[PDB]
């Protein structure tokens, strides 16, 4: 037979498998982005979606 | 003897300061007059011709 979802019943089981990250997924190496706006505003098309 | 090169120029005595005309570039260049708006500064410049 196949084993029983711990949720599906009212047991309670004080030892479970957790997943989890091998280390802080914060590494500090935040997205950087070079932005380079329109060089006329009067040339820009506003038209077309 | 020894002239490298001669150009046919704009007049300058003629195209004088006075006419707002520079010509040390060798083509017409009047600040101030026709000029671009909504572009960043030294976007003027060809204009100037």
């Known amino acids: ?49 | 003897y020894g002239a490298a090169v001669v150009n046919i120029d704009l007049n300058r005595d003629f195209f004088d300061t006075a006419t707002g005309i520079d010509l040390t570039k060798g083509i017409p260049l009047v600040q101030d007059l026709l000029v671009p708006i909504g572009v960043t500064a030294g976007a003027e410049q060809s204009a100037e011709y």
């Open chain 1, 1 to 49: 037979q196949v084993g029983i979802p711990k949720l599906e019943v009212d047991h309670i089981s004080f030892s479970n498998v957790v997943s989890m990250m091998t280390a802080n997924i914060r590494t500090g190496d935040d997205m950087a982005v070079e932005r380079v706006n329109p060089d006329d505003v009067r040339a820009i098309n506003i038209r077309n979606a």
